[PDB]
């Protein structure tokens, strides 16, 4: 845990950020999947142009 972003004894709201568990491997495999999207979306758009 890197941070605690809520004041104790406060009216918390649905969708508020409480902690921050350290994103390192999650940012890593997020970029590893974002690279696949950045290639295969180009593939989909090129073939969508060429089907016409």
């Amino acid at each position: 845990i890197l941070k605690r972003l809520f004041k104790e004894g406060s009216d918390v709201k649905a969708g508020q950020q409480l902690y921050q568990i350290d994103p390192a491997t999650y940012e890593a495999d997020y970029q590893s999947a974002q690279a696949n999207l950045a290639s295969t979306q180009e593939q989909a758009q090129r073939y969508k142009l060429l089907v016409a």
């Binding site: 090129r46 073939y47 142009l49 060429l50």
Partner: protein
């Protein structure tokens, strides 16, 4: 008689040859569209251009 045979067969041969040229021209145009969109490289475009030539 050989001249008449040439008149009789070269219309069929030349129409088949113009259809050959139309098919190869449309193949080159599709390879050019495939290159301009970006899927294949320029070497395959030059190969289609040599086939049309």
């Amino acid at each position: 008689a050989d001249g008449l045979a040439a008149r009789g067969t070269f219309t069929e041969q030349l129409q088949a040859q113009r259809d050959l040229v139309k098919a190869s021209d449309e193949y080159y145009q599709l390879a050019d569209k495939r290159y301009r969109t970006g899927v294949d490289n320029y070497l395959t475009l030059l190969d289609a251009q040599r086939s049309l030539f």
